[PDB]
From Swiss-Prot, chains A, B:
Keywords assigned by UniProt, alphabetized: Activator, Aromatic hydrocarbons catabolism, DNA-binding, Repressor, Transcription, Transcription regulation
Record's protein name: HTH-type transcriptional regulator CatM
An annotated Gene Ontology molecular function: DNA binding
Family assignment from sequence similarity: Belongs to the LysR transcriptional regulatory family.
Full-protein residues shown: 89 to 303 of 303
Amino acid sequence: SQTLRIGYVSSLLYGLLPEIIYLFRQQNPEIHIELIECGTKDQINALKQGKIDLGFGRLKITDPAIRRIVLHKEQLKLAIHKHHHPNQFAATGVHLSQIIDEPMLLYPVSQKPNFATFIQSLFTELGLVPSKLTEIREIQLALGLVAAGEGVCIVPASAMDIGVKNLLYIPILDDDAYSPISLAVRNMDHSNYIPKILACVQEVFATHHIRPLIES
Amino acid sequence: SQTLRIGYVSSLLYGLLPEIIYLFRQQNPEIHIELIECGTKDQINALKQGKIDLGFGRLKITDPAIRRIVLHKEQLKLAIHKHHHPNQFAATGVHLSQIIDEPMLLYPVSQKPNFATFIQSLFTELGLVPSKLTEIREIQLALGLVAAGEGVCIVPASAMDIGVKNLLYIPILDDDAYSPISLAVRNMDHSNYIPKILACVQEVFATHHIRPLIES
Ligand SMILES: O=C(O)/C=C\C=C/C(=O)O
Ligand SMILES: O=C(O)/C=C\C=C/C(=O)O
C-alpha cells in the first residue's frame, strides 16, 4: 500500500533513470511507484506539498526546505542537422561564440527557471546574445525541428540517442557546458526510499563506469 | 508571407517526416512552415477549419470533406524490457495471444479514436482482451515506463530507435499488425504544396528504398 511518487524531467528517460527505477522496483516489489513528469522548479513546490517524494531535476534551484543531491555532471552537445555548416561547425566542437547567429531552439515550455533559461544564461555569462530563440515544448520535439531544418539545439549528451535522424551532436568547448543531474528531497524526510534509491543510483552508475559526484 | 501549417503525430519525428519537411524547406525557402502537434482525429476538424493544411496521421479516420493519402504501411513491434520473459517472448516474434496477461501501456492520451483505441482493436478483432491497459500521454514516455518496468507497449517499428535503453523490440506475427502513415488534406484544396509535399515524400522514400503505397 506504499506509493513512491517520483518527479522527473523528460530527457532523463534517455539516460540511466529508467534503469535506476527498474532496479528499485526489483529490490522493492511491495512499493508502488508513480513516475510524474515535473520540471526542476515545479518539483520544489511538489516536494513541499507532498505531491512527490523524490525529484530528479537538472537545475540548481535551492530551497532551505529542500535537499539537493548532485548525482552526475552531464556534458552538453549542440544538436545540428548533419549538412548545416560543414566547415564552420567542426565535429571536434564549437564554442558558444560560434553559434550566436544561429536560430536556437530552447526547451521546454514550463514554469521558470528551467532548461531554456539555463541555456540562455550560458550565453549571457560569456557576454553572448543568441540572435533568435524559440522555446519548444519538449526536448524530442526540439530535436525533430532541428532535423526538419529549424536550426540548432543544445541538449545533454544522452540526447544523442533520441531517435531523430540526420543530426550530429557536436561538443560544446566552453568550460561551463554541463547539465548537472540531481535528486531533490524534503530536508526532514527520513524515509528509507531515499537511501534505497541512492544505492540503486550508485549500483547503476557503477555498471556504466560512472562515479557519482556524491559518495554513498 | 505564405504559411504552411502541418499537423503531425509524435512518433513520426523518429521516421522520415523530418527529412520530408527538410527537403520541402530546401526546395521552397519562401514558404514558412509551422509543425503542429495534432492527433489524426483532431486533424480532421483542424483541416476543416483551416487551422492546418496538411495532416500526417496514423489512423483511417475517413470524412467526405477530407482526402486521405496512404503513404506507408509500417510494421508494429512489441517493446519489452530485455529481461522480461526471455523464454516466452522469442526475438523472432509473438502473437498478440501470448501477451494478453501483460500490463500493456497504450498511448497517447488524446481525443479518440487514437493509437490507443487502435491498439485495443487489434486485440478485439482477434477475440482477445488485454488484462491491464494504462493510457500514457506520449510514445516516448510509454517506452520510458517499459524500461522502468511497468510492462510492455506496442509501437511502430521506427520507435526502435527512440533512445530509451534496455528495451527489445519484438515482431508481432499477426496479419493486421501494421500502422499506416497517411497524409490528410481538404478534398477541394488545390494548393501546389500538396503535389510538392508528395514529391518530397516520394524522393525521401526512394532514398530509403521505400515504395510509397501511392504512385506519383
Ligand atoms: O527545465 C528543467 O527544469 C530542466 C530540464 C527540462 C527538460 C529536460 O531535460 O528534458
Ligand atoms: O492517435 C493517433 O491519431 C495516432 C498516433 C498517435 C501518436 C503517435 O504515433 O506517436
